[PDB]
Design a protein around this nucleic acid. Structure first.
Length: 100
DNA sequence: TAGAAAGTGAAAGC
DNA sequence: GCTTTCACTTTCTA
């Protein structure tokens, strides 16, 4: 309910993170936007929200008290996601995963 | 074109 | 149940 997989599965379905969405509802496949922060269009508030929320959710980021750290948010999220043994990255700017 | 700023997996950490 | 660190590897933009 508050672990990465149920939390992510929930974030996906919310449809509030633009770009985060299902590609197959029944094999449990979804994509996460993965824009490079060094890119021209990139901006903290539209490309790092999902990563940021994961930090808020796990207490790693407290808004107002901490200085933003999207690099860390991105890397923390990617290592927590990769640590899950019941999620797979389909190595086919996005990343595509399957909930097993 | 280039180095700085991102980004990365994997082992070590709590 | 993931987070941090580490020793490198990438993506940029101009």
């Amino acid at each position: 309910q508050c672990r990465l997989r149920p939390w992510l599965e929930e974030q996906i379905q919310s449809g509030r993170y633009p770009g985060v969405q299902w590609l197959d509802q029944s094999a449990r496949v979804f994509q996460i936007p993965w824009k490079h922060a060094a890119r021209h269009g990139w901006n903290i508030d539209k490309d790092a929200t999902l990563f940021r929320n994961w930090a808020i959710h796990t207490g790693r980021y407290k808004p107002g008290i901490d200085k933003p750290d999207p690099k860390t948010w991105k890397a923390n999220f990617r290592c927590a996601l990769n640590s899950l043994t019941d999620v797979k990255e389909l190595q086919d700017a996005f990343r595509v995963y399957a909930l097993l």
